[PDB]
Design an enzyme around this catalytic site. Structure first.
Site, mmCIF file in Angstrom:
data_model
loop_
_atom_site.group_PDB
_atom_site.id
_atom_site.type_symbol
_atom_site.label_atom_id
_atom_site.label_comp_id
_atom_site.label_asym_id
_atom_site.label_seq_id
_atom_site.Cartn_x
_atom_site.Cartn_y
_atom_site.Cartn_z
ATOM 1 N N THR A 267 0.845 -1.216 0.000
ATOM 2 C CA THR A 267 0.000 0.000 0.000
ATOM 3 C C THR A 267 0.868 1.248 0.000
ATOM 4 O OG1 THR A 267 -1.328 -1.309 1.595
ATOM 5 C CG2 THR A 267 -2.337 0.650 0.636
ATOM 6 N N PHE A 392 -8.640 6.061 2.687
ATOM 7 C CA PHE A 392 -8.392 5.196 3.876
ATOM 8 C C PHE A 392 -9.692 4.551 4.350
ATOM 9 C CE2 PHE A 392 -4.745 8.050 3.828
ATOM 10 C CZ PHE A 392 -3.735 7.114 3.851
ATOM 11 N N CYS A 399 -8.793 2.601 7.785
ATOM 12 C CA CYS A 399 -7.377 2.164 7.859
ATOM 13 C C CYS A 399 -6.810 2.562 9.220
ATOM 14 C CB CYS A 399 -6.496 2.748 6.758
ATOM 15 S SG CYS A 399 -4.798 2.083 6.762
HETATM 16 C C1 HEM Z 1 -1.163 4.455 1.681
HETATM 17 C C2 HEM Z 1 -1.331 3.346 2.391
HETATM 18 C C3 HEM Z 1 -2.657 2.745 2.707
HETATM 19 C C4 HEM Z 1 -3.930 2.888 2.177
HETATM 20 C C5 HEM Z 1 -4.338 3.700 0.963
HETATM 21 C C6 HEM Z 1 -4.799 2.082 3.001
HETATM 22 C C7 HEM Z 1 -6.173 1.962 2.810
HETATM 23 C C8 HEM Z 1 -7.043 1.237 3.603
HETATM 24 C C9 HEM Z 1 -8.415 1.208 3.413
HETATM 25 C C10 HEM Z 1 -9.156 1.847 2.243
HETATM 26 C C11 HEM Z 1 -8.931 0.379 4.383
HETATM 27 C C12 HEM Z 1 -10.385 0.010 4.541
HETATM 28 C C13 HEM Z 1 -10.620 -1.376 3.883
HETATM 29 C C14 HEM Z 1 -12.032 -1.888 3.824
HETATM 30 O O1 HEM Z 1 -13.049 -1.153 4.137
HETATM 31 O O2 HEM Z 1 -12.217 -3.119 3.419
HETATM 32 C C15 HEM Z 1 -7.838 -0.036 5.215
HETATM 33 C C16 HEM Z 1 -7.958 -0.860 6.320
HETATM 34 C C17 HEM Z 1 -6.845 -1.294 7.030
HETATM 35 N N1 HEM Z 1 -5.552 -0.961 6.809
HETATM 36 FE FE1 HEM Z 1 -4.831 0.295 5.472
HETATM 37 N N2 HEM Z 1 -4.065 1.498 3.974
HETATM 38 C C18 HEM Z 1 -2.771 1.864 3.851
HETATM 39 C C19 HEM Z 1 -1.675 1.497 4.674
HETATM 40 C C20 HEM Z 1 -1.757 0.619 5.762
HETATM 41 C C21 HEM Z 1 -0.722 0.338 6.648
HETATM 42 C C22 HEM Z 1 0.682 0.897 6.559
HETATM 43 C C23 HEM Z 1 -1.223 -0.576 7.534
HETATM 44 C C24 HEM Z 1 -0.618 -1.183 8.716
HETATM 45 C C25 HEM Z 1 0.469 -0.804 9.293
HETATM 46 C C26 HEM Z 1 -2.600 -0.793 7.227
HETATM 47 C C27 HEM Z 1 -3.475 -1.633 7.945
HETATM 48 C C28 HEM Z 1 -4.872 -1.677 7.717
HETATM 49 C C29 HEM Z 1 -5.739 -2.509 8.537
HETATM 50 C C30 HEM Z 1 -5.321 -3.431 9.644
HETATM 51 C C31 HEM Z 1 -6.983 -2.270 8.126
HETATM 52 C C32 HEM Z 1 -8.247 -2.905 8.703
HETATM 53 C C33 HEM Z 1 -8.618 -2.040 9.924
HETATM 54 C C34 HEM Z 1 -9.925 -2.454 10.575
HETATM 55 O O3 HEM Z 1 -10.945 -2.638 9.816
HETATM 56 O O4 HEM Z 1 -9.946 -2.605 11.865
HETATM 57 N N3 HEM Z 1 -2.885 -0.011 6.147
HETATM 58 N N4 HEM Z 1 -6.671 0.543 4.731
HETATM 59 C C1 98B Z 2 -5.998 -2.016 2.228
HETATM 60 C C2 98B Z 2 -5.621 -2.517 3.602
HETATM 61 N N1 98B Z 2 -4.892 -1.463 4.320
HETATM 62 C C3 98B Z 2 -4.851 -3.808 3.645
HETATM 63 C C4 98B Z 2 -4.685 -4.372 4.927
HETATM 64 C C5 98B Z 2 -4.000 -5.558 5.088
HETATM 65 C C6 98B Z 2 -3.560 -6.275 3.973
HETATM 66 C C7 98B Z 2 -3.746 -5.750 2.696
HETATM 67 C C8 98B Z 2 -4.391 -4.532 2.542
#
Ligand code: HEM
Ligand code: 98B
Ligand code: ZP6
Length: 454
Positions: A267, A392, A399
């Site tokens: 990501t 996000f 996120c």
């Molecule tokens: C530019 C970087 C990133 C983008 C654009 C992004 C985007 C997203 C988005 C759109 C979701 C929602 C997904 C859904 O509704 O199915 C999400 C969830 C999540 N992201 Fe990211 N992400 C990024 C980086 C990261 C990083 C660096 C991590 C961890 C260190 C991470 C961990 C997670 C986790 C664990 C969730 C699920 C959270 C929950 O529902 O409790 N992401 N992210």
């Molecule tokens: C999009 C989201 N942040 C993601 C979380 C865990 C693994 C893949 C992608």
């Protein structure tokens, strides 16, 4: 109350063969351009609706009405990410438990503790580029993924992947990337029945075992030593949910580690790649961004405080997220019967898909110039309407990594702009590779050192 448009059909396969493409999101984007703010999408035994307008997506984002759904892609990723945060349902006990334990580990405040470790990896990136010979070029996605993987390794679990020492991946990453590859390929496929795909299935089961064994060892060797290194693994071993009072069990911790390792390979690496692409294709913008980097990062080692001052670099990253949100879709379900936008009646359980790149092109929000790279759109963050900008995602299922992603991307892009001039020496034609995420394939630059000491 009116009927939904639907793209072209393939008899009893319905819309499914529209996903027989290595670029499904891009194909869905062209369908949204044809059909508008909402279309029906059917596969055998499945019906979803793709949303593209801020008018309808602001309703989908109403948490009293819609919750996170696991799309078919998320159900296939769960075969190795389990009930980690990204692949758990909001109603599973392990979601709220993990969310309450880890939320403090991901605050803007916690970023001050990760800063030193991020700088350690960012300095390895700058030295790599300082040490290239005149003739050589930068493989941009490849180096950004080396940086983001190393950053999540060190901050997560105090583990060094040493990606800048390699041209061949860690045994974990080989399995992890090959698992994810198999998960997205399955979307279009005929059935889990063809003997042909048994080899793809055999391999998948060996990859789940490999990821599971190597992460279960990591947990084991950390409980062995008793050491308290301020990292996600420590927070997860000691941390107690205030609601249940319970800590996570070892199986859920392994799922969180896998989940975090994928995020930080797939990501942030994409964001940095898109950001550099738009900068070399927009010289006026690169110039404003490099002026801010040179004014602010006055020390050889950037401080937390200095990264918070890179406002314009922040705006570049938000403009890159607007055009090419690297996690491009998320899925919702109707909690109850409801009417979407006064027009589309849904029953309880009905699925929605939010096409984030299409939301970010809604001319009624952003004006006619939606295809232009203009970080100045983000100069005033209160000028952006609620739910117009969702890179996000949404609400409690947004996120958790947002501040971690932006701190790392701001730091690293700051340093790159401080340390080098950039040349689009091949006049690179954008080619967006689709995995779980988007990255610019084949994106190559040259850097010309500004010979500023580290
Ligand atoms: C530019 C970087 C990133 C983008 C654009 C992004 C985007 C997203 C988005 C759109 C979701 C929602 C997904 C859904 O509704 O199915 C999400 C969830 C999540 N992201 Fe990211 N992400 C990024 C980086 C990261 C990083 C660096 C991590 C961890 C260190 C991470 C961990 C997670 C986790 C664990 C969730 C699920 C959270 C929950 O529902 O409790 N992401 N992210
Ligand atoms: C999009 C989201 N942040 C993601 C979380 C865990 C693994 C893949 C992608
Ligand atoms: O996975 C889905 O259900 C849909 C595709 C689909 C398949 C079968 C019938 C109907 C729809 N997925 C999507 O629309 C998009 C396009 C390809 C990947 N994708 C997706 O949402 O993946 C989950 C995901 C993971 C990480 C970041 C963003 C999105």
């Amino acid at each position: 109350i009116k009927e939904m448009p639907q793209p072209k059909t393939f008899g009893e396969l319905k819309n499914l063969p529209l996903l027989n493409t290595d670029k499904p999101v891009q194909a869905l984007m062209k369908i949204a351009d044809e059909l508008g703010e909402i279309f029906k999408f059917e596969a055998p035994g499945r019906v979803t609706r793709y949303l593209s307008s801020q008018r309808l997506i602001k309703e989908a984002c109403d948490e009293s009405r819609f919750d996170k759904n696991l799309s078919q892609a998320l159900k296939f990723v769960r075969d190795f990410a389990g009930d980690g945060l990204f692949t758990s349902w909001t109603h599973e006990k392990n979601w709220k438990k993990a969310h309450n334990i880890l939320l403090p580990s991901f605050s803007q405040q916690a970023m001050k503790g990760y800063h030193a470790m991020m700088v350690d990896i960012a300095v390895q990136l700058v030295q790599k580029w300082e040490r290239l010979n005149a003739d050589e070029h930068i493989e941009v996605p490849e180096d950004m993924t080396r940086l983001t993987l190393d950053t999540i390794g060190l901050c997560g679990f105090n583990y060094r992947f040493n990606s800048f020492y390699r041209d061949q991946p860690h045994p974990f990453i080989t399995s992890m990337v090959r698992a994810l590859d198999e998960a997205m390929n399955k979307l279009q496929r005929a059935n889990p029945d063809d003997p042909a795909y048994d080899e793809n299935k055999r391999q998948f089961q060996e990859d789940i075992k490999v990821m599971n064994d190597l992460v279960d060892k990591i947990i084991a060797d950390r409980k062995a030593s008793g050491e308290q290194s301020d990292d996600l693994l420590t927070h997860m071993l000691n941390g107690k949910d205030p609601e249940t009072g319970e800590p996570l069990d070892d199986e859920n911790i392994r799922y969180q580690i896998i989940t975090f390792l994928i995020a930080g390979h797939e990501t942030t690496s994409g964001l940095l790649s898109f950001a550099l692409y738009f900068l070399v294709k927009n010289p006026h913008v690169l110039q404003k961004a490099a002026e801010e980097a040179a004014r602010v990062l006055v020390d050889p080692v950037p401080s937390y405080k200095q990264v918070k001052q890179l406002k314009y670099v922040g705006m570049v990253l938000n403009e890159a997220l607007r055009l090419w949100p690297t996690a491009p879709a998320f899925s919702l379900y109707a909690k109850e019967d409801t009417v979407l936008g006064g027009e589309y009646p849904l029953e309880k359980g009905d699925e929605l898909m939010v096409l984030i790149p299409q939301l970010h092109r809604d001319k009624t929000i952003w004006g006619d110039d939606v295809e232009e790279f203009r970080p100045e759109r983000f100069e005033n963050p209160s000028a952006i309407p609620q739910h117009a900008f969702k890179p996000f995602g949404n609400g409690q299922r947004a996120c958790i990594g947002q501040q971690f992603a932006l701190h790392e991307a701001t730091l690293v892009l700051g340093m790159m702009l401080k340390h080098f001039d950039f040349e689009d020496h091949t006049n690179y034609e954008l080619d967006i590779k689709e995995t779980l995420t988007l990255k610019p394939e084949g994106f190559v630059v040259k850097a010309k050192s500004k010979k500023i000491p580290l």
